[PDB]
Ligand binder design. Structure first.
Ligand SMILES: CCCOc1ccn2c(C(C)=O)cc(-c3ccccc3S(C)(=O)=O)c2c1
Length: 117
């Protein structure tokens, strides 16, 4: 509260560390569905059904331009990518499998970098 400061984690490395996580995502073999925005012209359903589209390129642009206030906002956009993927794609599809794999991959790097670290 007023004039009573809580201790706070050192956030000075967060930008570099999120950038490094994103680079590892962008170069994973199973990242191919997520590199660009889902093509709204070519993909029926998508626009209407997926209210907040997100992809790795859009995350990268945001990260590079100071549009994430903090590391939690970045993780929310990453998770949004995989939550969209599950909403639109069957688990059994190649895209659907890719998403489950990428999510697992992300959440372990997240824990190892910030939470269990
Ligand atoms: C023309 C039918 C293609 O339908 C889809 C439906 C969904 N997706 C996704 C996701 C994440 O839901 C991703 C793609 C896709 C797949 C291969 C190459 C390019 C794309 S994309 C990101 O340009 O739409 C893609 C393509």
């Amino acid at each position: 509260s007023m004039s009573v400061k809580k201790p706070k984690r050192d956030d000075s490395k967060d930008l570099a560390l999120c950038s490094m996580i994103l680079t590892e995502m962008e170069t994973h073999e199973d990242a191919w569905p997520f590199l660009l925005p889902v093509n709204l012209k070519l993909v029926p359903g998508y626009k209407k059904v997926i209210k907040k589209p997100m992809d790795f390129s859009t995350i990268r642009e945001k990260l590079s331009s100071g549009q994430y206030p903090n590391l939690e906002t970045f993780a929310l956009d990453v998770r949004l990518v995989f939550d969209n993927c599950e909403t639109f794609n069957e688990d059994d599809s190649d895209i659907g499998r890719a998403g489950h794999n990428m999510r697992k991959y992300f959440e372990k790097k997240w824990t190892d970098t910030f939470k269990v670290s």
